[PDB]
Design a protein around this nucleic acid. Sequence first.
RNA 1: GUACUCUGGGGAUAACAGGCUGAUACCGCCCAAGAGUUCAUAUCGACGGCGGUGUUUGGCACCUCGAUGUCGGCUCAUCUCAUCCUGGGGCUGAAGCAGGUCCCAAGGGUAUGGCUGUUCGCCAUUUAAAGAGGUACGCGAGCUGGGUUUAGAACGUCGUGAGACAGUUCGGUCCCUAUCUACCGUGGGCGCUGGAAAUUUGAGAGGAUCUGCUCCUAGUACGAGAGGACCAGAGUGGACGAACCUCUGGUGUACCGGUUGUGACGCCAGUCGCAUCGCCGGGUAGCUAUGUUCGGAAGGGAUAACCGCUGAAAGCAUCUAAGCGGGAAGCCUACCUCAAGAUAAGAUUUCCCUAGGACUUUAUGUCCUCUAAAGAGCCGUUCGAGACUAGGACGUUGAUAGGUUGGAUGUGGAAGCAUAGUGAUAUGUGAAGCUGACCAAUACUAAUUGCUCGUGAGGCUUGACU
RNA 2: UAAGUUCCGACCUGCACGAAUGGCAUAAUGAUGGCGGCGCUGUCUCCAGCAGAGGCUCAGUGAAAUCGAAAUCGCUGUGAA
RNA 3: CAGGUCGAGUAGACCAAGGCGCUUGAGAGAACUCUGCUGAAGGAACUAGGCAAAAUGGUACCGUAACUUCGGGAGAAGGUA
RNA 4: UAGUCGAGUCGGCCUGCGCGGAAGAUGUAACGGG
RNA 5: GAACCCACUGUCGUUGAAAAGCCAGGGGAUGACUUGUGGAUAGGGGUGAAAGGCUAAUCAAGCCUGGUGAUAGCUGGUUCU
RNA 6: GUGAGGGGAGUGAAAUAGAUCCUGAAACCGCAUGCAUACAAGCAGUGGGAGCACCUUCGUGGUGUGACUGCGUACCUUUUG
Lengths: 54, 116, 211, 122, 119
Amino acid sequence: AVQQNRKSRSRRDMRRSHDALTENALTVDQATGETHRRHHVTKDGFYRGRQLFA
Amino acid sequence: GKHPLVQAIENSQLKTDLPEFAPGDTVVVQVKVKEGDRERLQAFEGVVIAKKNRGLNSAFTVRKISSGVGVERVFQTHSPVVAKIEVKRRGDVRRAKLYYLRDLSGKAARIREKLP
Amino acid sequence: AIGLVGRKCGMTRIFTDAGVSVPVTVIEVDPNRITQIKTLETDGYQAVQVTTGERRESRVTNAQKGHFAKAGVAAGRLVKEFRVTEAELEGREVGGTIGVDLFTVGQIVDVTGQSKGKGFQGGVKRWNFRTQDATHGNSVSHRVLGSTGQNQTPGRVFKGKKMAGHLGDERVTVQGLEIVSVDTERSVLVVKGAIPGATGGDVIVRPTIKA
Amino acid sequence: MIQTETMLDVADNSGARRVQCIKVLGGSHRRYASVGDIIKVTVKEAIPRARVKKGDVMNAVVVRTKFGIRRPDGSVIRFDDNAAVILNNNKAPIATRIFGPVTRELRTEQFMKIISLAPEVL
Amino acid sequence: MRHRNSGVKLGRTSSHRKAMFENLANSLFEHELIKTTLPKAKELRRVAEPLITLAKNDTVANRRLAFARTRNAATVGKLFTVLGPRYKERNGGYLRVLKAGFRAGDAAPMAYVELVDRE
RNA sequence: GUACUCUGGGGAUAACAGGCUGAUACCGCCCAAGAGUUCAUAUCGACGGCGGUGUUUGGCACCUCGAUGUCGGCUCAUCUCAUCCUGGGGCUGAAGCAGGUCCCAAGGGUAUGGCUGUUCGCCAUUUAAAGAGGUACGCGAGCUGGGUUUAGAACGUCGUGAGACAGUUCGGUCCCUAUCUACCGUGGGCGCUGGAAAUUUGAGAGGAUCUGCUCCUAGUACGAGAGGACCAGAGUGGACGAACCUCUGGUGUACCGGUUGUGACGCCAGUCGCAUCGCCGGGUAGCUAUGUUCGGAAGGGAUAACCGCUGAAAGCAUCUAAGCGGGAAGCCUACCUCAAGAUAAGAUUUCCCUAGGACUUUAUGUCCUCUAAAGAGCCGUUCGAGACUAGGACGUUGAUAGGUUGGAUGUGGAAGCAUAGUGAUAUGUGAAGCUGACCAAUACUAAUUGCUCGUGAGGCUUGACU
RNA sequence: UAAGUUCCGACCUGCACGAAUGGCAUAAUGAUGGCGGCGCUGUCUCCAGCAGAGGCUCAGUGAAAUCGAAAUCGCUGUGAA
RNA sequence: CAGGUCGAGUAGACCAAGGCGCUUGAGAGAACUCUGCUGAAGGAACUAGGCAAAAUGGUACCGUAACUUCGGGAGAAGGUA
RNA sequence: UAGUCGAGUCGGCCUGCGCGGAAGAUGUAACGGG
RNA sequence: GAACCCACUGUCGUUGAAAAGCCAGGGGAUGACUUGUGGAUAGGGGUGAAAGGCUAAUCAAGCCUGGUGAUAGCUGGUUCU
RNA sequence: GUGAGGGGAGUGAAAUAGAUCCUGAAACCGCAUGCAUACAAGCAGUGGGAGCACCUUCGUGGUGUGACUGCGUACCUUUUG
């Protein structure tokens, strides 16, 4: 099965109308003040006033 | 039926005189039969092969040979129809369910007695 | 008619003196509190609104808080309406309570609930379609729908054709159920048979419409 | 649970030994027969010089089934064999002796003679 | 449908899944801090924590059961000499699972697994 | 001669299907020799005549040969009434039962097998009944490939032969990830006269409409006897449909045990890996039918055939022209479900927002400062909700999930030690040990500090009351 | 066989058998044609549960045949029908 | 060329010396499709046709029919440990 | 055949316009619609 | 009955892993057996336990070049006012 | 990232003459500005025609857009059509 006619650019864009991306949830962690992803450990191993590494 | 309200409703109907029996035993069950307006008691004798312990939902299966034809009946333990249970023999078996007895003939279907 | 909102607790059995085993369903009932009466003058139809259960304050919006405050009752997990007539509207005022005493042993009632969700389902389960042969050369067409229409006339698929889709998780009512027990102390109704939904679901009990 | 092509043993002294169900009576598209139902059977093996011959088409009533029957208290009764009893064209038993146990669902005016001649009823 | 079912699949045979989870438990008991995928970390609790509960009491039978489950003499010895005594007065919750972003190779979500009192 | 075939062309020209026509076919009506009745337009019905349909066999070659690709079976259907069953009537060589003919009625229902590739047809056994037809002789980008139509081979027949068939026989490749319309499910956006949370009315739409048997009236009405009711009431079945897991079962590769070969843990003992979950015996939750429960009620309005009341035209008669009535599984309601995108965008309860300055295109006009509430989302722990979504609960003022503790359940006598036995093994400690999803409690672990959106009292005209 | 257009046995009017383009029969042999039986079974009444691999969602890479152009609904009728 | 345990065996299961995990992954656990396991009662009622599936299966001993071209049929059938 | 009844009425032919005869399948679909 | 040589049934694949395969079954397996290296037979010819089979993914007359721009009463196309 | 790729500085008459380097068309694909567009059915134009934005000699003007409305089934070939 295949198309009988070539689709229009307008219809292609109408189909793509649902392709937009979305932002993640970013917050400032009070311990260090660096922006971090909500509910995740910071890149330096800090979370909820605890440091995993040494 | 593990919710407390269900447990209370079921506990309201539990029997309080059941004897202790185990699969290997031979038992006699007294069954109430009402014909017309007359009620009588009929005996059902056989070897227990399976026992489900589920409170008010408990049951036990009895197998016997009647004139060369095998008959199995599953009795609901707390049903009013079951009037009395009597344990005549106690056997010695190694498994909870004895379905293998269905394929064994008379002599091969013997169950050894448990001794004190 | 005036009914009751309750919760399905589970199934069990009842033994009669004769030895009959009756399967039954248990419904927990928190007495329903009246929050509003709708009348012809103001709403255009006659009805009684009730609430049941409890809800913590953080989960109650300000508007619903004001509504329950005007009613003079504590908030509940749900709010539901009962259509009624003038005769049964008597003796019912905002702030009152309706309990299990509304029913009697032996009465015939209808029970409404939400059926279990089966998700996406095919014709075999949704519409009892017959399967095709498992062997004798069948390639990939064991549980498929098969033919779906006629030829160039009419050259389409009609509305209402049965096809695979979502099954279950809908409102369902069962009629002709007999009340087996009314426990006032425990606030419980025991009904013969099965009622729709899963354990812990919300259910509605009403007098039988068919008499 | 008896259907077409099912073999049954004979619990009476009519002369037949094995029968095959060829139809379940009592309705359109009826699938199964249980204790007390009427079936159409053919005789496959008959004792020599008996009244019933091989290849005869007769009427019969199921008296024992392996699937079993349920009772009001919720119990189930099962048997080791599938057995029926032959009947005449008026649906009345044509035998003098009944072999093996039978059940109480036959306690009707139609089968009181089976009830009487059966050794054990349960 | 899967109404009221517990367990995971993770695209492995049952024996393979059991072996992988035992390896993860041994690594956790050895190191006390690991990084893995989030679903694996979440499933690892139901396997790792009962072992600590078992090791809370030191007997020949309990040690032999732990050896049957782990197949690692060093892990058994540590469980019955260090971790059990450390958590003797704790009612469960010996592990901590912390989300740690996503992994470059396949964008898979990741988490750290740590013992409650590591140092 | 080519079926071992090939190239250039044609729907200018056949086979299938569509189109026109209706000789043929089917159905209907008009007339009335005759038959039954040796007594009735009860039922047939000679010769002859007039119509309808497009279901048969045909006629014509208008469409397709830079392809509309196939008989039957399977799966799934929709419609017509010229009605097979069920429902309501008139007449009758209608005592009753039953039958014959004709009128009304399309709501529902409307077999399993043996023989044959068959559609058919014969047969056995059922049922209330096993109706006729249209839809590309419905349905092969949904399945099959038994027949029919390639290449092999054989018999019969024809031909000198290559070969061929008003014939027969064994064997013989079924492609396509769905763009558009259509359909079944499920979301996003905006709109609905400031915004928000919840409960709702019903214009309308869909679903469901089946039927056997027993008793009772009653051996009554009727009738030489035999035989046997209308009407009315109760019960119990078949098929179909829905929900559900208390009971009976199935499964249950994260539960328990028995056991074979082999390898390993230094060895014994005790364990683990592999061999279809190695094999075997049981089995908790969940899902499920063959298991359980429930339903097709009863009613109301109009009405078809038919039956009337009163009544003139037409002094009589007449169901009709005035007026007025009864009447069916048929129609509208009634029972279940959906339903205000019903742009006609409906109703009710409660809740939130009432700051300042500058400018000109003089206005629900712009710009700056200040202020962003009621709520809704993001995120997290999750679900008896789920393809993704959507939907439900909870987020420290917590029982949302995991773990822990205690029950329950299943399996059926753990390891170690001791004793008896030459040994295989048996007994005691002890119904012990272990036990996925179940129930109750518990803050031990995780649901942190948070961010974004959503504003600042809501134009104009007329009228009623303030 | 309950029911046999197939099969086995018998009849002979052979539409249109017949003797080395061989006739009748024959033990053994055949992934050879036809008919029947025991055991067995999810082939079926009538399907249910479970295991693996896809399907679905996320991240990376990234085809196909087709295509005059499209703001690409139903019914009835008309029309190279 | 090719070892160990059992084994008639270079068949088969698990291992030694040796070699390898094979150049997209992470989740979810719908319809539908492919592969596999179990299944109540019935047991070919399926279908052109038992197609496919199910079933039998080793060693030792006993016992084994019609018909034969006297070799066979013949591991006939069937039974015991 | 009478008559207590009191004036139209009985039966035909030729013509205009109407009535029955009149059943099919996708959806009113035999005035283009109102 | 393994290796080795074959290709009887069924499923999957049919823009395949593959321009002929995989999986589960199946046949021969001391012989008219299988197989390596090197040779002979050439197109109206060769070879053929015989299917018009094979003769480099091509066979009722191989492939390449030349006659050659063959012929075509056939189909298509044929450009500004 | 001591990568690729750019920005500044400098050369040159010229650097969108910067090394797949004269000019740089079309198909196809981005960004920005103005108008229209989420109650309405079809070869997408044509004849009318309100409103809006910009430029205005403010005009009976010019440039974009086009609510609402009548009419309206592409091109070539081949054909009786």
